[PDB]
Enzyme design. Structure first.
Site, PDB file in Angstrom:
ATOM      1  CG  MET A  24      62.271 -57.325  11.943  1.00  0.00           C
ATOM      2  SD  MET A  24      61.472 -58.273  13.329  1.00  0.00           S
ATOM      3  CE  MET A  24      60.076 -58.506  13.046  1.00  0.00           C
ATOM      4  CG  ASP A  25      66.408 -51.485  11.907  1.00  0.00           C
ATOM      5  OD1 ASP A  25      65.080 -52.022  12.668  1.00  0.00           O
ATOM      6  OD2 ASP A  25      66.214 -50.773  11.700  1.00  0.00           O
ATOM      7  CB  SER A  26      69.735 -53.333  15.637  1.00  0.00           C
ATOM      8  OG  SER A  26      70.757 -52.629  14.848  1.00  0.00           O
TER       9      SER A  26
END
Ligand code: CDL
Ligand code: 3PE
Ligand code: 3PE
Ligand code: 3PE
Ligand code: PLC
Ligand code: PLC
Ligand code: PLC
Ligand code: PLC
Ligand code: PLC
Ligand code: PLC
Lengths: 353, 161, 80, 78, 55, 95, 183, 105, 149
Positions: F41-43
């Site tokens: 998961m990115d930001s």
């Protein structure tokens, strides 16, 4: 026909008497709305309604007919129970209060030894019908107005009830007709001038009339509890409010100005001596005369309702609560002790006769 | 046709299906009105008017408290009931309206005989006051004492100060 | 229908609805007193009926104040 | 001490004035209510100087003569 | 203590609504004066030669 | 009444299902499962998951904790320690 | 008093419907062993107009009938039938004498009472003429017991409470006697 | 001794005398037991509810049914509507069946 | 300068009261006088030539129980609740035309039908427990058993 036609009128006669009674009250209520604007207009150096009917005599008819020809606003056709139950309770309450008003000796639809209680009890139901409009409503101005109606009811209810009880105590009766006939030699305006002011002040608060118009304050709550009402539900509430103004004006004339008793006994006998008592025309004139005395006194207080509206600014309801509980209640409960003490001192305790 | 039976039939239906607190404060008013009218037309017109004078003032104070305590809970909630179970319940209830089982006391009609001995003829409220202020004056003065306690009691409960 | 306690379904699901039930239950006692007093032509029963009405109104006010303060306690932060 | 609060048992007259100037809704309601029992206390004066109390109404039923039945009464017989 | 009116003087103006009754009387005077209303369109308000209207 | 009825196994089980409805690299989620590495998961995806896990348990992560959260087990620890049932009306409890 | 009872007509027919009232008649006469007596046939206004003359004529019989009731000790309506018949005949005798001696004066007074809510204070003028006529022809004087003769309300010169409406016939009949009798 | 059974006009009502004779019997010093006052208790309770008298009317109505007697031939005539207490029913010489006035006395 | 236009609505309001009073005073008084003329329609409506002037009876107010007994007593003599008669002797039909109202003595419908108001420990006992009615049935049975003695 003939005989069947003639005694069918006898079978329907008392219904016409009631229809004439209803018609007479609605005429005063209809033309009080016209008279208020005419009275305010000239006090404000304008004319008031004079373009709807000859000299403005159809202004009340136009207002009712136009409002009766308007769409009723409600979420659904089956939601009549919401915004119609309230207006009907308010209207039925004030109209039933007129059953005990005597236009002459014995000329009241209801006569009983507890007519005073019926009068106070019937009007208290109208207060309930007003608050029903804010029935979990999403209109914040209707909701804000419902709170103020309860606050005003607490203010005036004790004072108005106690004042009428002092008048009933002086005659030792709760029959309205007996109270009127007890004022033959003296009008209660003279011995109870402070109570007449307090009764009228209470009447202004009961009817939500200025300077106590905190419920329908246009500059504060657009229309108060009426902001969501249109067409027929608005007429019924408007009709009942002006019916209450006529009722409280007539009660001011009954409790303190002798009701239907003549202003001059000499003139009253002079006018009635022109008509033979063995003819039905004597009793028509007497009915006009006695009601005229009541009409004149009630017209002055209906004028006074309009008069105070055109002279005094509005008072906040939280100040009205302090005024009724800290000033009016101590004074009225003082007189409820004052009056029996005076009468006992001079051996003049009242009895019914 | 005794139309008061129909009025109580509707009231019992609406008491079973009532959901929110506003409907309950309407069941109260829908109960006092049949009481007031039936007292007016059958037994005591004095107490029909006393009920109206006192209970209405209590009703409005009751209504104003609903405004300050209404808490969104029962507008969006769901009830199940069932139309058939409601009407069947009301039918079984309507079957038995004999509060007393003395059949002769409920069926045989009686009369009273008037007499002219009471020439000093006054209302029931004058006799009630005559006894209440003379013989049962202690009852009146205790009631005055209880009303005083309520005044002090309401202040010591509600007033933050 | 009474013996299976059908009245327990007719009482609403708020504390105020219990208050209304109590008022209705007491009002049943007063109607029974008025009915008996009128049939007997007895003013002592009507004095009793008047006492019941005044007393029943006193507890209605005392109970309301308790419920009023109970609701204030929940809304106690009052940072405004 | 231009506008202090008077002590009632030291300066009763000034204590009355303070409430009559600052709380008229209290001072004069009491003053009216005091006139009730004061007039009831003046009732004995009226019974001696103006007029006596009226004779009580015959509100105890039919006045029965305090005697035995007349056994010689006749007239309007069958 | 530093007022110019007696307690009964101030209470009589207070209980009997002295200034309120005066305001009513002033209002009742206007009831007997000539109103200002003109009956448009049968009568027109004054106009000046500098008036700006339809082009 | 006004107390939590949460167990570590239920909170983990509900956390896994809410995380399974996202687009994660693996469906095998346990306490040690990291958000950046294991799930990927990115930001923005992480904060979509946090709010999704907020709605499921009716809890609100504080800003300090949310910015510093690494593993699935940290969320389960937070829910168990901070969850409170919502206050009910004056009638729900006593009636 | 408008209290609903089980001994007379009530306020309205809704009261009858709730009570399921039956207005019951009995076709049987009084038993033949009891002597017959003709009942008094006057209505409310004539009886109130004649109330103080029945009292001044039947005082011995009225008291004897009431004293019989006290001595009956519960057995009242049975043990005072003979005394009651004397009361009825004596009262009818007064009404008979009114219609033969003071007919116009009597009918004037109770026609004013019907005109004036049956209040004695509204019909003093017709009452004064009837009192004068009865006293001359029957030697009956109206007396209100318990008070001095000069404090009787019906003889008050300047009463505080007076009728609002004047009975025209009483005004005419009062003037005629003023100019012809008290010259 | 407080007042009980006070009529609507302030005096004794219909059943006060029965109650008064019960109190006098129960409080008399000549009575060894309360047996003498048992009939007085039933009389007072009969004055209020008339339960035995209603029971007697139940027997008479039922006994008349079993012998085929007509209720309208052995009972008392009655009128249910107050407006139809007409002069013909009342038996007046010039009676009529027209309704009587009950609207306003 | 009295503004007459403003006083017009008050004149109509004044005439509003006079309409009610003029009708009520005359219509009611005429009906009471009409029904006091006799016991049938041919006497109430028609006016005899040998009769004198019509004397009117005004509506009654502030009544008590005696006025209710008087009203029924007048009805038994004249067929009107405010009939007029000063005859020293009544008709024969007056001896047997007494009216006796017989009514039930049952509790109000609201007492025995309201879903909540009908429930109490003593009301359930009166309705569902035969303990009270067993005892009172013994009293009624003694009345018929004791006839023989
Ligand atoms: C009667 C008394 C009036 C009188 O004699 O005649 C004047 C009056 C006509 O007034 P007016 O002719 O214009 O007065 C002369 C000047 O125009 C008036 O010229 P003016 O305006 O210059 O005069 C001023 C005069 C005002 O004019 C007056 O004098 C009116 C008097 C007002 C007090 C009494 C009311 O004085 C005042 O301003 C006093 C007002 C302050 C009093 C406030 C009230 C205190 C209580 O004549 C009538 O009385 C009849 C007309 C009234 C209407 C009748 C029909 C009513 C319609 C009902 C429906 C049908
Ligand atoms: C209208 C509904 C009336 C409901 C009802 O049941 O009323 C009963 C009424 C009794 O007859 P009533 O005419 O009232 O007595 C007159 C005696 N002088 O009998 C009736 O129903 C007559 C009602 C007909 C009159 C209706 C209103 C007439 C005036 C309309 C203008
Ligand atoms: C002038 C007439 C005034 C009344 C006319 C309107 C008729 C409606 C019912 C009036 C009273 C009958 C008995 C009702 C008792 C209260 C029960 C209630 O909740 O009100 C019924 C009303 C209908 O709502 P509904 O949609 O049918 O049901 C909810 C569906 N989820 O739900 C509502 O909340 C609407 C209620 C509006 C405010 C009514 C306030 C009560 C007024 C009672 C005055 C009359 C006394 C009762 C007389 C009849 C007795 C049965
Ligand atoms: C409907 C029924 C009618 C109801 C209305 C009845 C009308 C009568 C009104 C009742 C009141 C009458 C009493 C008025 C006199 C009392 C007021 C008074 O005297 O003043 C208060 C007085 C203080 O003196 P003070 O006025 O302050 O003088 C200095 C001013 N710088 O304080 C005092 O010391 C005076 C104490 C009382 C002594 C006189 C008694
Ligand atoms: C109330 C009785 C007085 C009627 C007034 C009147 O007849 O009024 C005149 C009417 C209404 O027209 P308007 O423009 O409002 O008249 C006002 C004139 N102004 C503008 C100068 C003030 O004109 C008409 O004749 C048209 C309608 C035909 C006659 C029917 C009238 C309505 C009858 C209902 C009531 C009886
Ligand atoms: C305050 C002003 C009104 C006022 O003073 O009204 C009272 C006075 C005086 O009438 P009274 O003595 O009360 O008795 C009333 C006597 N009648 C029946 C003759 C009116 O009425 C007027 O002079 C008008
Ligand atoms: C014993 C004899 C009793 C007399 C009978 C009459 C009692 C009246 C009491 C008034 C007291 C008062 O006006 O009170 C004022 C109060 C609160 O005012 P406050 O905040 O205390 O400031 C004032 C205190 N000062 C001045 C000492 C600092 O509110 C009001 O403004 C109420 C205004 C009411 C006006 C209603 C109009 C009615 C018109 C009637 C036309 C017929
Ligand atoms: C003789 C006639 C005149 C007597 C006047 C006496 C005043 C006493 C007083 O006011 O007593 C003083 C006290 C306390 O004063 P405070 O305002 O609380 O503070 C004092 C002032 N400070 C702030 C400067 C310290 O007040 C009370 O207890 C008021 C009770 C009055 C209740 C009246 C209710 C209405 C009843 C009317 C009849 C039905
Ligand atoms: C008759 C029944 C109707 C009127 C009853 C009540 C009237 C007022 C009583 C209190 C007066 C008071 O308190 O008087 C106090 C004041 C004046 O006194 P001051 O300020 O010291 O004067 C300063 C010094 N001077 C005395 C040299 C002037 O008077 C008034 O403002 C009187 C106003 C009355 C005019 C309007 C009359 C009509 C009113 C509407 C009637 C429907
Ligand atoms: C008074 C009078 O003579 O009454 C005549 C009447 C009505 O007159 P009004 O001025 O409308 O009465 C209103 C009463 N006020 C002015 C006091 C408000 O008029 C006719 O019906 C003729």
């Amino acid at each position: 026909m003939l005989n069947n036609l003639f005694d069918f009128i006898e079978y329907i006669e008392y219904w016409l008497i009631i229809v004439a009674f209803v018609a007479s009250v609605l005429i005063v209520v209809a033309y009080l709305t016209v008279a208020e604007r005419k009275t305010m207009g000239y006090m404000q150096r304008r004319l008031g309604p004079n373009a709807v009917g000859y000299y403005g005599v159809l202004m009340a008819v136009a207002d009712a007919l136009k409002l009766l020809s308007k769409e009723i606003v409600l979420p659904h056709n089956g939601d009549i129970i919401y915004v119609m139950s309230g207006p009907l309770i308010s209207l039925f309450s004030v109209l039933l209060s007129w059953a005990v008003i005597p236009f002459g000796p014995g000329l009241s639809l209801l006569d009983s030894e507890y007519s005073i209680i019926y009068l106070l009890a019937s009007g208290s139901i109208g207060v309930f019908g007003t608050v029903i409009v804010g029935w979990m409503s999403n209109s914040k101005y209707t909701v804000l107005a419902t709170v103020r109606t309860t606050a005003q009811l607490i203010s005036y209810e004790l004072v108005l009830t106690t004042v009428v009880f002092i008048i009933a105590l002086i005659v030792s009766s709760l029959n309205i007709n007996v109270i009127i006939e007890s004022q033959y030699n003296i009008w209660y305006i003279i011995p109870f001038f402070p109570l007449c002011l307090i009764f009228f002040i209470s009447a202004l608060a009961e009817t939500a009339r200025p300077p106590f118009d905190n419920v329908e304050a246009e500059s504060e709550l657009v229309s108060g509890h009426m902001t969501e009402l249109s067409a027929s539900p608005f007429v019924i509430f408007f009709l009942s409010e002006y019916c209450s103004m006529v009722l409280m004006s007539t009660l001011t004339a009954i409790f303190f100005f002798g009701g239907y008793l003549p202003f001059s006994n000499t003139i009253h006998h002079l006018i009635l001596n022109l008509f033979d008592q063995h003819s039905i025309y004597y009793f028509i004139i007497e009915g006009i005369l006695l009601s005229g005395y009541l009409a004149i006194k009630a017209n002055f207080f209906m004028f006074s309702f309009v008069w105070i509206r055109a002279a005094a600014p509005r008072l906040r309801y939280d100040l009205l609560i302090l005024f009724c509980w800290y000033v009016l209640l101590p004074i009225v409960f003082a007189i409820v002790v004052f009056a029996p003490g005076i009468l006992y001192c001079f051996d003049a305790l009242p009895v019914i006769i | 046709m005794n139309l008061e039976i129909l009025d109580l039939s509707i009231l019992g239906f609406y008491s079973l299906i009532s959901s929110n607190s506003f409907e309950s404060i309407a069941i109260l008013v829908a109960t006092i009105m049949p009481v007031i009218t039936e007292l007016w037309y059958n037994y005591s017109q004095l107490f029909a008017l006393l009920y109206t004078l006192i209970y209405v003032g209590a009703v409005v104070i009751l209504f104003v408290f609903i405004l300050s305590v209404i808490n969104e809970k029962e507008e969006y909630e769901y009830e199940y009931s069932g139309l058939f179970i409601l009407i069947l319940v009301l039918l079984l209830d309507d079957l038995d309206d004999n509060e007393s089982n003395d059949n002769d006391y409920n069926n045989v009609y009686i009369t009273d005989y008037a007499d002219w001995f009471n020439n000093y003829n006054e209302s029931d409220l004058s006799v009630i006051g005559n006894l209440l202020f003379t013989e049962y004056a202690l009852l009146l003065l205790i009631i005055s004492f209880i009303l005083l306690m309520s005044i002090i009691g309401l202040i010591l409960i509600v007033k933050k100060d | 229908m009474d013996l299976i306690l059908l009245m327990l379904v007719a009482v609403g699901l708020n504390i105020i609805d219990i208050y209304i039930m109590i008022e209705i239950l007491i009002m049943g006692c007063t109607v029974n007193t008025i009915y008996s007093a009128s049939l007997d032509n007895d003013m002592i029963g009507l004095i009793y009926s008047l006492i019941q009405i005044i007393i029943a109104g006193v507890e209605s006010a005392i109970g309301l104040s308790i419920l009023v303060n109970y609701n204030r306690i929940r809304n106690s932060e009052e940072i405004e | 001490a231009i506008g202090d609060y008077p002590v009632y048992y030291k300066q009763p007259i000034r204590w009355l004035s303070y409430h009559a100037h600052t709380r008229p809704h209290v001072f004069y309601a009491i003053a009216v209510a005091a006139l009730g029992p004061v007039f009831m206390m003046a009732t004995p004066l009226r019974r001696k100087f103006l007029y006596d109390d009226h004779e009580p109404l015959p509100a105890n039923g039919y006045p029965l003569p305090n005697r035995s039945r007349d056994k010689t009464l006749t007239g309007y017989d069958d | 203590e530093e007022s110019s009116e007696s307690a009964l003087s101030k209470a009589t103006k207070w209980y009997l609504l002295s200034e309120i009754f005066r305001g009513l009387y002033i209002t009742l005077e206007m009831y007997f004066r000539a109103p200002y209303t003109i009956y448009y369109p049968f009568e027109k308000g004054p106009v000046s030669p500098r008036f700006r209207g339809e082009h | 009444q006004s107390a939590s009825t949460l167990t570590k196994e239920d909170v983990l089980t509900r956390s896994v299902s809410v995380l399974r409805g996202f687009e994660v690299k693996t469906k095998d989620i346990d306490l040690q499962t990291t958000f950046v590495q294991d799930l990927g998961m990115d930001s923005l995806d992480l904060n979509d998951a946090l709010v999704a896990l907020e709605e499921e348990f009716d809890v609100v992560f504080d800003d300090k904790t949310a910015n510093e959260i690494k593993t699935v087990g940290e969320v389960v620890d937070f829910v168990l320690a901070n969850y409170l049932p919502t206050e009910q009306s004056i009638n729900h409890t006593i009636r | 008093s408008s209290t609903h009872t089980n001994d007379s007509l009530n306020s309205s027919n809704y009261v009858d419907k709730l009570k399921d009232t039956h207005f019951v008649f009995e076709n049987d006469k009084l038993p033949s062993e009891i002597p017959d007596v003709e009942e008094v046939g006057a209505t409310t206004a004539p009886l109130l107009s004649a109330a103080y003359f029945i009292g001044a004529k039947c005082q011995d019989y009225n008291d004897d009938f009431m004293l019989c009731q006290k001595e009956a000790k519960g057995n009242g309506p049975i043990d005072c039938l003979k005394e009651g018949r004397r009361v009825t005949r004596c009262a009818s005798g007064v009404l008979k004498d009114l219609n033969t001696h003071c007919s116009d004066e009597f009918r004037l007074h109770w026609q004013c009472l019907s005109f004036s809510n049956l209040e004695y204070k509204n019909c003093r003028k017709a009452e004064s003429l009837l009192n004068k006529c009865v006293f001359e022809k029957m030697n009956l004087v109206k007396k209100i017991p318990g008070i001095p003769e000069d404090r009787q309300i019906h003889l008050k010169q300047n009463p505080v409470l007076k009728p609002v409406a004047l009975h025209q016939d009483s005004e005419v009949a009062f003037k005629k006697a003023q100019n012809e009798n008290s010259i | 001794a407080p007042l009980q059974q006070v009529g609507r006009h302030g005096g004794p009502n219909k059943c006060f005398g029965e109650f008064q004779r019960v109190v006098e019997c129960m409080t008399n010093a000549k009575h060894d037991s309360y047996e003498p006052c048992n009939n007085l208790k039933n009389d007072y309770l009969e004055c209020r509810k008339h339960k035995v008298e209603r029971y007697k009317a139940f027997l008479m109505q039922k006994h008349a049914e079993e012998l085929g007697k007509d209720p309208e031939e052995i009972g008392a005539p009655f009128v249910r509507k107050r407006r139809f207490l007409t002069s013909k029913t009342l038996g007046l010489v010039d009676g009529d069946d027209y309704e009587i006035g009950v609207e306003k006395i | 300068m009295i503004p007459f236009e403003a006083l017009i609505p008050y004149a109509i309001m004044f005439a509003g009261f006079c309409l009610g009073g003029g009708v009520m005073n005359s219509a009611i008084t005429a009906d009471i006088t009409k029904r006091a003329r006799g016991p049938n329609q041919e006497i109430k409506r028609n006016v005899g030539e040998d009769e004198g002037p019509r004397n009117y009876t005004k509506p009654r107010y502030n009544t008590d129980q005696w006025d209710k007994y008087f009203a029924v007593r007048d009805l038994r003599l004249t067929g009107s609740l405010r009939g007029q008669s000063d005859n020293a002797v009544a008709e024969e039909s007056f001896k047997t035309n007494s009216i006796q109202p017989y009514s039930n003595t049952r509790r109000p419908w609201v007492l025995r039908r309201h879903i909540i108001m009908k429930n109490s420990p003593t009301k359930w006992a009166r309705k569902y427990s035969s303990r009270r009615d067993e005892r009172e049935q013994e009293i009624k049975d003694d009345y018929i058993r004791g006839m023989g003695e």
